[PDB]
CSV table of C-alpha atoms in Angstrom, one decimal:
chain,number,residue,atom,x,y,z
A,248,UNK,CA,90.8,194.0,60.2
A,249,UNK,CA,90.5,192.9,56.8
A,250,UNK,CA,87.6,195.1,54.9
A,251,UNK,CA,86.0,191.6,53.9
A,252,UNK,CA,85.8,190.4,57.1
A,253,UNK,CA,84.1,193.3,58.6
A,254,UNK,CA,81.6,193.5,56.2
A,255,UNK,CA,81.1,189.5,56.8
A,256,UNK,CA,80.9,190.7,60.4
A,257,UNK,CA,78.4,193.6,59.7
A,258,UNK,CA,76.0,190.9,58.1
A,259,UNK,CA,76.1,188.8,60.8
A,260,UNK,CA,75.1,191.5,63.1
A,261,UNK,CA,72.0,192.5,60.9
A,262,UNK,CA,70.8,188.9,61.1
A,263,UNK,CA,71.2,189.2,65.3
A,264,UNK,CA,69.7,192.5,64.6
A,265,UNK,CA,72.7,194.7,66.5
A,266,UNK,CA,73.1,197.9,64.4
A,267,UNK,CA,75.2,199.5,67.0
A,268,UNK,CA,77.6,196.5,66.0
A,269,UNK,CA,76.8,196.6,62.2
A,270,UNK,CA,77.2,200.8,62.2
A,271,UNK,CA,80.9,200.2,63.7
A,272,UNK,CA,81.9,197.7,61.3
A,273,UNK,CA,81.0,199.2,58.8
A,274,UNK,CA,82.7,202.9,59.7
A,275,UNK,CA,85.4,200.8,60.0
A,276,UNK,CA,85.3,199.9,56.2
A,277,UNK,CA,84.1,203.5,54.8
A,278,UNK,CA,87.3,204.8,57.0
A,279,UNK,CA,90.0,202.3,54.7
A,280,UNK,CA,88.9,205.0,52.3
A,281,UNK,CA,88.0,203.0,49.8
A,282,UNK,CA,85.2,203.7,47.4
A,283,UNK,CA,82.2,201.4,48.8
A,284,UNK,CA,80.8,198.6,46.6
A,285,UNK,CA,76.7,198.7,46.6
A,286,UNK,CA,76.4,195.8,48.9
A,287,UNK,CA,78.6,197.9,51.5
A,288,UNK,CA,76.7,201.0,50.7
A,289,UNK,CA,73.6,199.3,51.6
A,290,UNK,CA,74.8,198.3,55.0
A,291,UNK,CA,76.2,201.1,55.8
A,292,UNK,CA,72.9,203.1,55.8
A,293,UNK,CA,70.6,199.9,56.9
A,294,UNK,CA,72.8,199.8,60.0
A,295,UNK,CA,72.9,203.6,60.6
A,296,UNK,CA,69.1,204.0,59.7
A,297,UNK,CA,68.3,201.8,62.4
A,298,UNK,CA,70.7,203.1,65.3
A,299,UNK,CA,69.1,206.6,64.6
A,300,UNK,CA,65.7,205.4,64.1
A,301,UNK,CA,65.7,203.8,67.7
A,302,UNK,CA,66.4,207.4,69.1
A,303,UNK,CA,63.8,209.1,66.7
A,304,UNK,CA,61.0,206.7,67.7
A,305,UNK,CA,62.1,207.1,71.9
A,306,UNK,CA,62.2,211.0,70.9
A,307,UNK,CA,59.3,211.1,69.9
A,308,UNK,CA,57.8,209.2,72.5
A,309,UNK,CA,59.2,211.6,75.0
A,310,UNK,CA,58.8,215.0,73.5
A,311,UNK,CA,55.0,214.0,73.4
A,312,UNK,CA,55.0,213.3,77.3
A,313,UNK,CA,57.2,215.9,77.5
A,314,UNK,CA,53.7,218.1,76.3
A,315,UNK,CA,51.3,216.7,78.0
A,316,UNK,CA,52.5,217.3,81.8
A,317,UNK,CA,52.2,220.5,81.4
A,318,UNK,CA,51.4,222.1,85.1
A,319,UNK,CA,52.8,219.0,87.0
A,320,UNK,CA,56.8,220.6,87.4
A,321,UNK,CA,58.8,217.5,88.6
A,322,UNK,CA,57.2,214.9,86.2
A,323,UNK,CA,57.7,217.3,83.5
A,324,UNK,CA,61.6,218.5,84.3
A,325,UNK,CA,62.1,214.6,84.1
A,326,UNK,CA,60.5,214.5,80.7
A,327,UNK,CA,62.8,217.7,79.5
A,328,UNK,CA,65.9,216.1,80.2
A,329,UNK,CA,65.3,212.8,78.8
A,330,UNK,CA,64.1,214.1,76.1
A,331,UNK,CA,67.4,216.3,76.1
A,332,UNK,CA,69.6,213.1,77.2
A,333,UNK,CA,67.7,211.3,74.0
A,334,UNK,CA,69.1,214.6,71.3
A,335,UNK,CA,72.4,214.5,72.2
A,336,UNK,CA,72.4,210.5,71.3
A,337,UNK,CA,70.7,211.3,67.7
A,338,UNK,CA,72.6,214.4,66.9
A,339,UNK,CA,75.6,212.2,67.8
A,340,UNK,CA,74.7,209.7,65.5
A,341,UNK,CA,73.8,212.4,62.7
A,342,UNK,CA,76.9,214.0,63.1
A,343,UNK,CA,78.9,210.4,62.9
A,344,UNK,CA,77.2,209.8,59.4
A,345,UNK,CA,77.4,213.5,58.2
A,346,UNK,CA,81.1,213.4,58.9
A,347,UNK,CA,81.9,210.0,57.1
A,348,UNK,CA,79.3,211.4,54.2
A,349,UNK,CA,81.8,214.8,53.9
A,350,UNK,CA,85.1,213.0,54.6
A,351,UNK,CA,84.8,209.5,52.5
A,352,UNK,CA,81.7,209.1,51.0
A,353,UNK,CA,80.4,212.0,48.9
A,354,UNK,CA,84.1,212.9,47.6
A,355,UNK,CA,85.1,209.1,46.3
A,356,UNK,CA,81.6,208.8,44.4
A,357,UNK,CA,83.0,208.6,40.9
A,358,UNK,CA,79.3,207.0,39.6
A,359,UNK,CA,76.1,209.7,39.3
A,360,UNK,CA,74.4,206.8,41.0
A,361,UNK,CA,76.5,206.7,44.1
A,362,UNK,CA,76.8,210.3,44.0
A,363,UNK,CA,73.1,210.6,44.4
A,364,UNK,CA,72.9,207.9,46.9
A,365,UNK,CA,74.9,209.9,49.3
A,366,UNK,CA,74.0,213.5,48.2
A,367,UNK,CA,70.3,211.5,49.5
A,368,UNK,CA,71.7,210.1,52.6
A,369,UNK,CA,73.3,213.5,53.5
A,370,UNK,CA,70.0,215.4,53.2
A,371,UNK,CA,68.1,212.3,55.5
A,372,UNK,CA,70.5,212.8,58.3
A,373,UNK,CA,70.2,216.8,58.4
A,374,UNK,CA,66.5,216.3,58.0
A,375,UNK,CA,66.7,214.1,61.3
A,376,UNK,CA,69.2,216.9,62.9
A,377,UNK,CA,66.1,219.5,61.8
A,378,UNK,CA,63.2,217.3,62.8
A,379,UNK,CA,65.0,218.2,66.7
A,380,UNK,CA,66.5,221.6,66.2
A,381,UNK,CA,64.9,224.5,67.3
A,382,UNK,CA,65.9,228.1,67.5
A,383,UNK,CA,69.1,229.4,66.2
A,384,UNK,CA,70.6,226.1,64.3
A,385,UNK,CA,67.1,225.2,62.7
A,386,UNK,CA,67.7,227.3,59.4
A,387,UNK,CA,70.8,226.2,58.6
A,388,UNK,CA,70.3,222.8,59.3
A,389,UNK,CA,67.1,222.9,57.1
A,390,UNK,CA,69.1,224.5,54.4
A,391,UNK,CA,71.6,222.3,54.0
A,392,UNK,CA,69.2,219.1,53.9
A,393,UNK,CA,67.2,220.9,51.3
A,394,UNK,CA,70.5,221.8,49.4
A,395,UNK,CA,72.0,218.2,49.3
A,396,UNK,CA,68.7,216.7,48.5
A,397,UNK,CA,68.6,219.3,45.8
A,398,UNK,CA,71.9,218.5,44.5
A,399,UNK,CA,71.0,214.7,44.8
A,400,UNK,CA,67.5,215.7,42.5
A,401,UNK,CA,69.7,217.5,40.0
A,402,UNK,CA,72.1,215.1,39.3
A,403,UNK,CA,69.3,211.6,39.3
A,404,UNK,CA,67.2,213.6,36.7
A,405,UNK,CA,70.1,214.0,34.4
A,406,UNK,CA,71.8,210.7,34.7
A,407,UNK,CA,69.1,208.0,36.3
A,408,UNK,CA,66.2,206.6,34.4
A,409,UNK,CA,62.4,207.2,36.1
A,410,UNK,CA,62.2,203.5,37.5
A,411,UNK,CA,65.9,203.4,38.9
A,412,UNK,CA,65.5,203.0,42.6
A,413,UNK,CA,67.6,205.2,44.9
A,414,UNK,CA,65.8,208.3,41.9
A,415,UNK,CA,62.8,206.9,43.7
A,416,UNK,CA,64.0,207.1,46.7
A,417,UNK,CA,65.4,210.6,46.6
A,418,UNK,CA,62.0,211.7,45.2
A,419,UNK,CA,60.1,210.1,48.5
A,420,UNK,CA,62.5,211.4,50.8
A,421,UNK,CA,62.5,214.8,49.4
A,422,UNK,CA,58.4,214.9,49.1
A,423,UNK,CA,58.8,214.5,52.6
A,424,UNK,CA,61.2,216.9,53.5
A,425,UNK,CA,59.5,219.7,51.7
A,426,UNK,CA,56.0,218.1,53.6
A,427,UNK,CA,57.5,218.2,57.1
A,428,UNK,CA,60.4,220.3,57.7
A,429,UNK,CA,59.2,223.2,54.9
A,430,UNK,CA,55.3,222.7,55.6
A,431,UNK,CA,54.3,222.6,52.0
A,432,UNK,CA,52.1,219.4,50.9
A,433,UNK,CA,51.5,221.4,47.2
A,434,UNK,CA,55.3,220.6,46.2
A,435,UNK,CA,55.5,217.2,48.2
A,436,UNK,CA,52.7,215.8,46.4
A,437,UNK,CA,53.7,217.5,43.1
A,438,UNK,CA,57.0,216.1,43.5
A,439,UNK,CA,56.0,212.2,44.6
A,440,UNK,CA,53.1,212.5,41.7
A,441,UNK,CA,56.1,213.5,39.0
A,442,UNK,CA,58.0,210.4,40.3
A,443,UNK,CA,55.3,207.8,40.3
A,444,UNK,CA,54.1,208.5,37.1
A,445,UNK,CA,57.3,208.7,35.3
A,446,UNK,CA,58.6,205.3,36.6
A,447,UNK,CA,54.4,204.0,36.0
A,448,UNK,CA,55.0,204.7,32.5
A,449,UNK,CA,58.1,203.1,31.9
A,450,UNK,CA,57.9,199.2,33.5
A,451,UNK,CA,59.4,198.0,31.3
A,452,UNK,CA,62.9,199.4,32.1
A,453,UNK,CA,62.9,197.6,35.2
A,454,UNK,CA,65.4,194.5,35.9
A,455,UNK,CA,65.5,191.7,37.8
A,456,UNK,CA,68.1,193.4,40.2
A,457,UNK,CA,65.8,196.6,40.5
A,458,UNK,CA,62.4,196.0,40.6
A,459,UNK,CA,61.4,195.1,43.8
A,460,UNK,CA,62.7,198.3,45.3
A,461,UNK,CA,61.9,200.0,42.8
A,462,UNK,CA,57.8,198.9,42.9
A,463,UNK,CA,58.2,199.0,47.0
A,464,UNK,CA,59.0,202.9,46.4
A,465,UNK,CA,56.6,203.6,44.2
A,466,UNK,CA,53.8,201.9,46.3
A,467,UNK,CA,55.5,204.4,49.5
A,468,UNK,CA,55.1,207.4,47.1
A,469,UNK,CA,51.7,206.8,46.1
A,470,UNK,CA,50.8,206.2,49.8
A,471,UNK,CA,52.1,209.2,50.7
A,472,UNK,CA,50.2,210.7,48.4
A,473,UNK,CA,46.9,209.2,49.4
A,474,UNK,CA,47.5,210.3,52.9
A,475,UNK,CA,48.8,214.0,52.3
A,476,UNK,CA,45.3,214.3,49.8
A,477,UNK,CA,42.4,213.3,52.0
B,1170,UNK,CA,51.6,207.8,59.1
B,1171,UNK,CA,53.8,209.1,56.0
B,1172,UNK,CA,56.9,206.4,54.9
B,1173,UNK,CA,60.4,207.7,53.7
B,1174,UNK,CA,62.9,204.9,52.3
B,1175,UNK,CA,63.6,201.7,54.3
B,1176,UNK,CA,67.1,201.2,55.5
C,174,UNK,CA,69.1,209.4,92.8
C,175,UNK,CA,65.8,209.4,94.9
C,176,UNK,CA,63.6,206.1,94.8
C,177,UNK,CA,60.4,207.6,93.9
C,178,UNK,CA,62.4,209.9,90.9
C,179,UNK,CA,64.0,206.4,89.9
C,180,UNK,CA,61.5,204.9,89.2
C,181,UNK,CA,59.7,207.7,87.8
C,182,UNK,CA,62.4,207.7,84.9
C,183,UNK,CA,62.1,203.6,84.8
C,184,UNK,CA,58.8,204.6,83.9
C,185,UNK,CA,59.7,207.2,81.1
C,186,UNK,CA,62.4,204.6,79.9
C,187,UNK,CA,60.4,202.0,79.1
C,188,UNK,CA,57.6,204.0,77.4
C,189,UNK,CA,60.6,205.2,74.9
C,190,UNK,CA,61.6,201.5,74.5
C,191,UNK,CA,65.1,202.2,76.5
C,192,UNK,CA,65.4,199.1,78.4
C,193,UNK,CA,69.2,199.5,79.3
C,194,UNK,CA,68.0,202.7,80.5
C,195,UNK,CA,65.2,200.9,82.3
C,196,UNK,CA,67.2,198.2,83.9
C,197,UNK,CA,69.8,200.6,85.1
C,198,UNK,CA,67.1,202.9,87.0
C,199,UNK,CA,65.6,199.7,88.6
C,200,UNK,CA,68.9,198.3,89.6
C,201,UNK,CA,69.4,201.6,91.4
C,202,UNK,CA,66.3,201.2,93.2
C,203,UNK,CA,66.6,197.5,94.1
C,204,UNK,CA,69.8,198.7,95.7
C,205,UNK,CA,69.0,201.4,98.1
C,206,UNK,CA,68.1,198.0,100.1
C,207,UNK,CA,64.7,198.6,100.8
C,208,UNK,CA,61.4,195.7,100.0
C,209,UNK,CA,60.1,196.4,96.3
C,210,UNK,CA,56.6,197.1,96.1
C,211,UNK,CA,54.5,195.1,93.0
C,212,UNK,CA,54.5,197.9,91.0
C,213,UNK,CA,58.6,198.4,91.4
C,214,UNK,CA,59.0,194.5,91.1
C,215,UNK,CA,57.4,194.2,87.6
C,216,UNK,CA,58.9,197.2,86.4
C,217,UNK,CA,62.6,195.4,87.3
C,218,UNK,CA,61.2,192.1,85.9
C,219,UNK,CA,60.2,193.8,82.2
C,220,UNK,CA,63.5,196.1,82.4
C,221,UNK,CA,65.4,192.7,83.0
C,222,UNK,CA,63.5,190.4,80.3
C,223,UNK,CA,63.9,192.8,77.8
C,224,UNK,CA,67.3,193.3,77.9
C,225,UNK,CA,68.3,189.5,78.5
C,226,UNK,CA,65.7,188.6,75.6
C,227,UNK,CA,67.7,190.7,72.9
C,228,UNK,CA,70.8,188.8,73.5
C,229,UNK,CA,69.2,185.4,73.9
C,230,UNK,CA,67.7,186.2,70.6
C,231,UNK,CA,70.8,187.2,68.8
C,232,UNK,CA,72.6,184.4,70.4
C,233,UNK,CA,70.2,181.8,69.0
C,234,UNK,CA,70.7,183.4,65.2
C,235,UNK,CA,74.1,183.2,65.5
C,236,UNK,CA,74.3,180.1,66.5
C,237,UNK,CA,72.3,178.6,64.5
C,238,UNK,CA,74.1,180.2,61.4
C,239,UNK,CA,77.4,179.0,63.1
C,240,UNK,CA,75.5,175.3,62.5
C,241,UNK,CA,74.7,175.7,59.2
C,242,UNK,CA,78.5,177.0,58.3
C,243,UNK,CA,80.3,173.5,58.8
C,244,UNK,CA,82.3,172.8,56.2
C,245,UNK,CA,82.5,176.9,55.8
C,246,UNK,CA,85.8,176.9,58.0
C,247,UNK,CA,85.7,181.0,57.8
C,248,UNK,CA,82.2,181.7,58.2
C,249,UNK,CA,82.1,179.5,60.9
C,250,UNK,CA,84.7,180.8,63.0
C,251,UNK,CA,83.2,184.6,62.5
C,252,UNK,CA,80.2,183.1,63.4
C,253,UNK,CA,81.9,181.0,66.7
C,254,UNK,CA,83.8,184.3,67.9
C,255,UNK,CA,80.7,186.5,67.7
C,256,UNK,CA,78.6,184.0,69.6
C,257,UNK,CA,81.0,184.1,72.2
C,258,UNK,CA,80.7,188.4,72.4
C,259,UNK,CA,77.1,188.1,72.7
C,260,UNK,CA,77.5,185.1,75.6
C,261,UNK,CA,80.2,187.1,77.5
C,262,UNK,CA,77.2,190.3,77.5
C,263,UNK,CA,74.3,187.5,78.2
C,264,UNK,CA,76.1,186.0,81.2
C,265,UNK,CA,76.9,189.6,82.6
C,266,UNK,CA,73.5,190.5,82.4
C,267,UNK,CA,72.4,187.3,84.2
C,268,UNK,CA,75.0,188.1,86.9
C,269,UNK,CA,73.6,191.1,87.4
C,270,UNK,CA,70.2,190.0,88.0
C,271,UNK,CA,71.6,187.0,89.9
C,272,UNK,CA,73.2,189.0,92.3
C,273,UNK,CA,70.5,191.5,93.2
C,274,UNK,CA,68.1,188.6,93.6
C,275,UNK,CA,71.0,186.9,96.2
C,276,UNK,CA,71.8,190.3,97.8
C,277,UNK,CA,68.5,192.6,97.9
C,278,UNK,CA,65.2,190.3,96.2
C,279,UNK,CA,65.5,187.5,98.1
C,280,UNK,CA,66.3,188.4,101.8
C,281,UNK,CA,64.0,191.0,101.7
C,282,UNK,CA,60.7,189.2,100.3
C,283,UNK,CA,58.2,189.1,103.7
C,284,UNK,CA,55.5,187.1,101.6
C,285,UNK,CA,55.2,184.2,100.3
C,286,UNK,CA,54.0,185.6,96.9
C,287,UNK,CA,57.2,187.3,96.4
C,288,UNK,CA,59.2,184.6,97.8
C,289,UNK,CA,58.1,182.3,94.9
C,290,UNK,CA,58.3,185.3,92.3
C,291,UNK,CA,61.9,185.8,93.1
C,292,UNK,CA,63.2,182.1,93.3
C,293,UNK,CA,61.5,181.9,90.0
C,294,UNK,CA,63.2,184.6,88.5
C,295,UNK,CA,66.2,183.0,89.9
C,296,UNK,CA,65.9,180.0,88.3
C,297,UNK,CA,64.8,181.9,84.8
C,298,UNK,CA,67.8,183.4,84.7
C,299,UNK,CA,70.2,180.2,85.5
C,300,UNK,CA,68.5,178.6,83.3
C,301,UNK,CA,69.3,181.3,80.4
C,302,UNK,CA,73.5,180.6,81.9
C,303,UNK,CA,72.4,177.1,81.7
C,304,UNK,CA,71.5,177.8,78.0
C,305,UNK,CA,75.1,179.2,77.0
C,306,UNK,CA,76.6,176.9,79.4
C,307,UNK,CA,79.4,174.6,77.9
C,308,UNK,CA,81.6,172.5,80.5
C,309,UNK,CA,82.4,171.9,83.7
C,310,UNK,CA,80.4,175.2,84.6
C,311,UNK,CA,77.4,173.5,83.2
C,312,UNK,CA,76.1,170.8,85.6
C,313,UNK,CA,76.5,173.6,88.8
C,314,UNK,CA,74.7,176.1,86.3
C,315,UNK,CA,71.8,173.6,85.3
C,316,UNK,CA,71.8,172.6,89.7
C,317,UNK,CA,71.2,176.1,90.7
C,318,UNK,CA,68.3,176.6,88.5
C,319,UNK,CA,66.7,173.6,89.6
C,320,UNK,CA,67.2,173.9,93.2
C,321,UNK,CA,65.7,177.9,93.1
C,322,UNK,CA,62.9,176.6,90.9
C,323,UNK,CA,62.1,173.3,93.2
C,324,UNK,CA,62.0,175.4,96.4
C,325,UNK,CA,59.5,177.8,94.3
C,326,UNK,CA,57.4,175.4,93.3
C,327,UNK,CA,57.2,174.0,96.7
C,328,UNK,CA,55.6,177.2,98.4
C,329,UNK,CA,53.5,177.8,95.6
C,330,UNK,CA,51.7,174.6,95.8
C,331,UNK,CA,51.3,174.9,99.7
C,332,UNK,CA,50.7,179.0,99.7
C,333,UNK,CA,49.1,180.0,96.4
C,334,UNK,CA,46.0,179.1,94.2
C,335,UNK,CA,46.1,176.9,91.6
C,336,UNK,CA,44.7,179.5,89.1
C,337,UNK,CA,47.5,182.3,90.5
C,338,UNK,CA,49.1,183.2,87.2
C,339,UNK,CA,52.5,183.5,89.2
C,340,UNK,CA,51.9,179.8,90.3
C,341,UNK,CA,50.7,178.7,86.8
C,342,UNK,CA,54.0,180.4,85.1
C,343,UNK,CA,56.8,179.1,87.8
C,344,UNK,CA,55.1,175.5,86.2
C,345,UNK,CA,54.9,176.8,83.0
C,346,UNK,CA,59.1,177.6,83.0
C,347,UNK,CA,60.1,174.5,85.5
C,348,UNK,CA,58.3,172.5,82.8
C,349,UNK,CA,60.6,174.0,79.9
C,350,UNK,CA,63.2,173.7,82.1
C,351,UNK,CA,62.7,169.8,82.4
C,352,UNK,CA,62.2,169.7,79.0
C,353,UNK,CA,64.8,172.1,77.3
C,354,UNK,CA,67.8,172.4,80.2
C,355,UNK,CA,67.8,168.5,81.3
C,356,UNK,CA,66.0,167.1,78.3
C,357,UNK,CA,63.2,164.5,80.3
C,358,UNK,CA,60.2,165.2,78.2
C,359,UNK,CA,58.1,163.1,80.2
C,360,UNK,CA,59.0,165.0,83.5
C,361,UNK,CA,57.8,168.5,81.4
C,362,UNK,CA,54.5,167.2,80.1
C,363,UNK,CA,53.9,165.1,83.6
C,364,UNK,CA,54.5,169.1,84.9
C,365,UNK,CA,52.9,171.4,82.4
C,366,UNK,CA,49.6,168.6,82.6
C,367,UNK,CA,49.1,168.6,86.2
C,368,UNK,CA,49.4,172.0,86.7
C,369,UNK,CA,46.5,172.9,84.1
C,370,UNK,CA,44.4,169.6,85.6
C,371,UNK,CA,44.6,171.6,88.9
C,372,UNK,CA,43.5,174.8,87.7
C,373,UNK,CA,40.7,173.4,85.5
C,374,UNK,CA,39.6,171.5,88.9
C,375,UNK,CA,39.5,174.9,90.6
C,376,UNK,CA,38.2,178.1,88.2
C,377,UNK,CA,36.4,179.5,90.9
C,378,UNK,CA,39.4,180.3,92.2
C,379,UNK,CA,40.0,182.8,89.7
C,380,UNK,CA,39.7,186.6,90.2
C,381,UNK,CA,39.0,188.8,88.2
C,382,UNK,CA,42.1,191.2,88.7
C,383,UNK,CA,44.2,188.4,86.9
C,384,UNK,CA,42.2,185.8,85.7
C,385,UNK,CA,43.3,187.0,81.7
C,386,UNK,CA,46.9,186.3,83.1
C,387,UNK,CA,45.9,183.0,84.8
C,388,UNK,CA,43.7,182.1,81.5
C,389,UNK,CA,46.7,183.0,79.2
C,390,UNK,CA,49.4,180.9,81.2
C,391,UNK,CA,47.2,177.9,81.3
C,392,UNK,CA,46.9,177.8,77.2
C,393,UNK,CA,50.3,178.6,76.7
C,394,UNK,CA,50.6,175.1,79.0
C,395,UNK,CA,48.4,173.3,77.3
C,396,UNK,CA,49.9,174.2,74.0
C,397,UNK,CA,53.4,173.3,75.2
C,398,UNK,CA,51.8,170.2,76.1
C,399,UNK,CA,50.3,169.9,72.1
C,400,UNK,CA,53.9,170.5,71.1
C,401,UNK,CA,55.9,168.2,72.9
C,402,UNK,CA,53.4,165.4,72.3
C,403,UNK,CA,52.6,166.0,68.6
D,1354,UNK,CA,58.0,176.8,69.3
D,1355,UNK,CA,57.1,176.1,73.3
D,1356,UNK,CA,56.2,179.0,75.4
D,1357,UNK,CA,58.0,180.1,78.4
D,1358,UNK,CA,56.0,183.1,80.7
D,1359,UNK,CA,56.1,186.4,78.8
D,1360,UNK,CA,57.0,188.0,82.1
């Protein structure tokens, strides 16, 4: 219907906490093809982050079981294909974002900010396509999270102050990526240690809009870094 | 365990 | 489609937090006709709570921001229409469970134990209609859970322990039921009191296979009882 | 609020 009702809608269902329901409304308003505001940016990927997320945390859960029943056939067949049943939901999903990121998103972005906001979200959702990929499809899919996030990286350090968030953001996410898909904590904690001590020195650019994400991040990089150091 | 961005 | 695979993958679901996927392996089971054992019985019960419990969640934020709209004609009608989505999947899901508890559950329960866990879980879930109930549908609604909770209550006082955590819990829910569904307070603390009375009369008759269930149920009485009297 | 069983 009308794009301010389905965004009225989407809200509603983040309160009831249905993100199946909030991910469909608000597809429904990236595909008017309209550029998005910020609040309907932020819902979008709220509402997809937690539809995938649910599917990470069951893959997870059954990969691992998957492993451990070794030697015990049936039990472990069963495991397979639920696990199997549990990828094709999440690369689904991926795929879904990916294509609205490609077709609407990325090429409307007429702000660095939103540019980089996407560029970011591109690179998470082939970073969930490579934490399942194996074999043949794993290198590409690893380069092309590691060349959005890139591009993303590029474009905040030109045009994005140290304390703005989503620079923050793209700097945590990245540190990860290069931590977990690439296996190197040297450049994931160079990387998060850059971005917390840029934004450290330079408080006082915060607003009253920005700085509870942005301190939030900054706490999550520093954490990060606390763990990938001991 | 490690965090990435919320939402 | 085997029993013994079923609920093998009931198992899986639930460890991955999949309780659609839970419900709908359990539902198979209860349907190939056959008595469940304890172990199958619980795992239908959690499957079922789970899934019921997400929309009578939602259902009660919406709701209650469809109360604080008025005067908000808008809001409040996005609000109204969305309520009514979530009721129309909240009464399916009861009718579900309604009708393998008529058809399969309660035929097929040989002992009394069952007996009272199935006419409890047959009131539980008219009650949860009775919550969304509006109209003429409501006083039948509110009747049938009454009727399938009185004739539980009456073989669990003449077959079971006062300490038996399934006995303690049909009074726990016939109490909120008084309370909640036909709004006598008196009847729900004259309930909830007696039924912890009894078990404090009779701790010896707790074992130690359940007595943390049994021990549980009889504070979460006596705290209804704190609330409804404070 | 008042308690109804967890199962």
């Amino acid at each position: 219907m009308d794009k301010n009702e389905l965004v009225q809608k989407a809200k509603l269902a983040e309160q009831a906490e249905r993100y199946d329901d909030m991910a469909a409304c608000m597809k429904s308003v990236t595909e008017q093809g309209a550029e998005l505001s910020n609040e309907e940016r932020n819902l979008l990927s709220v509402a997809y982050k937690n539809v995938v997320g649910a599917r990470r945390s069951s893959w997870r859960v059954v990969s691992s079981i998957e492993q451990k029943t070794e030697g015990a056939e049936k039990k472990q067949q069963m495991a397979r294909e639920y696990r199997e049943k549990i990828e094709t939901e999440l690369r689904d999903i991926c795929n879904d974002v990916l294509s609205l990121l490609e077709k609407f998103l990325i090429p409307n972005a007429s702000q660095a900010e939103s540019k980089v906001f996407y560029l970011k979200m591109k690179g998470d959702y082939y970073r969930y396509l490579a934490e399942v990929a194996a074999g043949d499809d794993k290198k590409g899919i690893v380069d092309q999270s590691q060349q959005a996030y890139q591009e993303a990286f590029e474009i905040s350090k030109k045009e994005m102050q140290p304390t703005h968030p989503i620079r923050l953001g793209l700097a945590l996410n990245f540190s990860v990526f290069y931590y977990e898909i690439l296996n190197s904590p040297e450049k994931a904690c160079s990387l998060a240690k850059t971005a917390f001590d840029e934004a450290i020195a330079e408080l006082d650019t915060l607003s009253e809009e920005s700085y509870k994400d942005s301190t939030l991040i900054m706490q999550l990089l520093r954490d990060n870094l606390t763990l990938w150091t001991s | 365990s490690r965090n990435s961005t919320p939402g």
